[PDB]
Amino acid sequence: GSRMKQLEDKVEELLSKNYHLENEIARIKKLVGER
Amino acid sequence: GSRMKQLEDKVEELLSKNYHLENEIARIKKLVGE
Amino acid sequence: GSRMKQLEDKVEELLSKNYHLENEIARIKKLVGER
Secondary structure, three states: OOHHHHHHHHHHHHHHHHHHHHHHHHHHHHHHOOO | OOHHHHHHHHHHHHHHHHHHHHHHHHHHHHHOOO | OOHHHHHHHHHHHHHHHHHHHHHHHHHHHHHOOOO
């Protein structure tokens, strides 16, 4: 349960968080587009 | 401090930034009613 | 490199990714604003 392993666990969560946020950004950007 | 602390600080900063961007996209959704 | 280096490098990349998303978000903020 080293600090290393704990941070590797946290980075896995960050990859997940970024995945969904990216997709949501893309969805809103597509919806609205340019004028 | 230390090399490991610098890393922990960056991981904290990452979690913070992500939360901020989540919040931002939430506010954008309100502006467009989505 | 080392276990520790490899994690350091993944964190930098994640900071790169977050900067990019911040800019995409900022762009969308302009797209849904008044013009």
